[PDB]
Amino acid sequence: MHVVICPWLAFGHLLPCLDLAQRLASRGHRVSFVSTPRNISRLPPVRPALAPLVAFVALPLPRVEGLPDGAESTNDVPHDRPDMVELHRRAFDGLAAPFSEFLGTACADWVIVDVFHHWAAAAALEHKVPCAMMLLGSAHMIASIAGMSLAERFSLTLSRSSLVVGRSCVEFEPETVPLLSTLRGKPITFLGLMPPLHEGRREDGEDATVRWLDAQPAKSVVYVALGSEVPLGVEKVHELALGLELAGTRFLWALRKPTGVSDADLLPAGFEERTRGRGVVATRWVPQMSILAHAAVGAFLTHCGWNSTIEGLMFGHPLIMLPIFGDQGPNARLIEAKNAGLQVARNDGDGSFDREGVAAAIRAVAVEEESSKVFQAKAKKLQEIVADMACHERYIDGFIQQLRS
Ligand SMILES: C=C1C[C@@]23CC[C@H]4[C@@](C)(CCC[C@@]4(C)C(=O)O)[C@@H]2CC[C@]1(O[C@@H]1O[C@H](CO)[C@@H](O)[C@H](O)[C@H]1O[C@@H]1O[C@H](CO)[C@@H](O)[C@H](O)[C@H]1O)C3
Ligand SMILES: O=c1ccn([C@@H]2O[C@H](COP(=O)(O)OP(=O)(O)O)[C@@H](O)[C@H]2O)c(=O)[nH]1
């Protein structure tokens, strides 16, 4: 088959979609991976053996008064500047005509589009190509669901699609998957957890963060990362920093800068001096797979993005969960229900957190002997399912069979 894949302009969508493209191309299918040129330039290279089976289709973002050049992804357009988010959604919707012209002569058997690709589902109808909507989260997230707002883009895309695709399996969510047939009349299929192939990410294993981990004792380091895009304002960065200090563990922290905050204001006065040698903060993209694979990392403090949830559990890390938006609440509650992590306590009213809730969550999951040992044993049980790479490949074969029918 020829499959056209159109991910949302966001690295938590681009990365698993490129992995999927390569898994289809491995079974002898052809893929057109459609995105914007700077997003494509920042992706890991395709295995040379799949090179002619994964065609990159670069559609340049239309210039929209005030959207900076190169600002192509949710990693470049900050959630704390909603004016710029809106400008980015306009640029995205401007891909409609270049995309419809491309699909016309693509000889596509299937279009696989992301949640906001309402124009791509419409092109699919125009050119009579079956259209699958990617909803590459948990069964629990999909059960919860069962210009324009995100809700209207989603509903329009869903209305124009014939198939909805989730990233889970009955083995991980036996209580939800057998209950699901359709999302608003559209058949649901699960292509498995599709945990990333470590090699496929092509990270630097000489990265300074990994060389720091090499000097730490086994299971001693709390890895802290909130994915590629969720906002965390400076007051909340300070509370997370002071929480990490109060719990007293070693930590490696991948931190994104809130817009308009200087290097001097970023972190509490003297925080880096007081934690020097015990903790490292990196305000750059880190090799998350090499970090989670490392013997020194014990617990993962995660925003519970679905990629970070799968990646954390596939290496048997118990989770300290700080969900920010979207599917992260459901993802966090799902893992808490399996006893493999604990949410940071939140105020009902604003959803805020403080240093003490952060510290208490780290202590219970990573420090207190009795609780920490239960969290590790429960994360290990989840790893048996999440890291069953053969099982997940069989789910990709199952999804390809769903598409031929
Ligand atoms: C993956 C997702 C599909 C989504 C579509 C809308 C949907 C969901 C919110 C589920 C419930 C029904 C419904 C219709 C709704 O709007 O209430 C659904 C799941 C999360 C979602 O997340 C988005 O992910 C992107 C990266 O992964 C962000 O670039 C984006 O910005 C998130 O959208 C965010 O949605 C949050 C929840 O409403 C908001 O708090 C946040 O401001 C918004 O950006 C948004
Ligand atoms: O510094 C970073 C931050 C994120 N990631 C990767 O980016 C993705 C983040 O996706 P997730 O669903 O966890 O969160 P999102 O960015 O969509 O909120 C995951 O595959 C991570 O391995 C990374 O490699 N380095």
Numbering used by the authors: 15 to 160, 201 to 459
What did the paper state?
Here, we report the biochemical and structural characterization of OsUGT91C1, a glycosyltransferase from Oryza sativa, which is efficient at catalyzing β (1–2) glucosylation. It also catalyzes a third reaction, β (1–6) glucose addition, to create previously uncharacterized compounds. The enzyme’s ability to bind steviol glycoside substrate in three modes underlies its flexibility to catalyze β (1–2) glucosylation in two distinct orientations as well as β (1–6) glucosylation.
We chose STB, which lacks the R2 glycan, as a means to obtain a complex with the R1 end at the catalytic site. We could build both glucose 1-R1 and glucose 2-1-R1 into the electron density at the active site. The position and volume occupied by the steviol aglycone in this rotated arrangement are very similar to those complexes with R2 glycans at the catalytic site. In addition to steviol aglycone rotation, glucose 1-R1 of STB undergoes a 180° flip around the glycosidic bond to the aglycone. As a result of the flip, it is 6-hydroxyl, not 2-hydroxyl of glucose 1-R1, hydrogen-bonded to His27. In this orientation, glucose 1-R1 does not form a bidentate hydrogen bond with Glu283 but retains the hydrogen bonds of the 4-hydroxyl with Glu283 and Trp22. Glucose 2-1-R1 is found in a previously undisclosed pocket where it makes contact with His93, and its hydrophobic face stacks against the aromatic ring of Phe379. We believe that these interactions with glucose 2-1-R1 stabilize the flipped arrangement of glucose 1-R1. Guided by structure, we constructed three mutants H93A, H93W, and F379A, to suppress β (1–6) glucosylation by eliminating the cryptic glucose pocket seen for glucose 2-1-R1 in the STB complex.
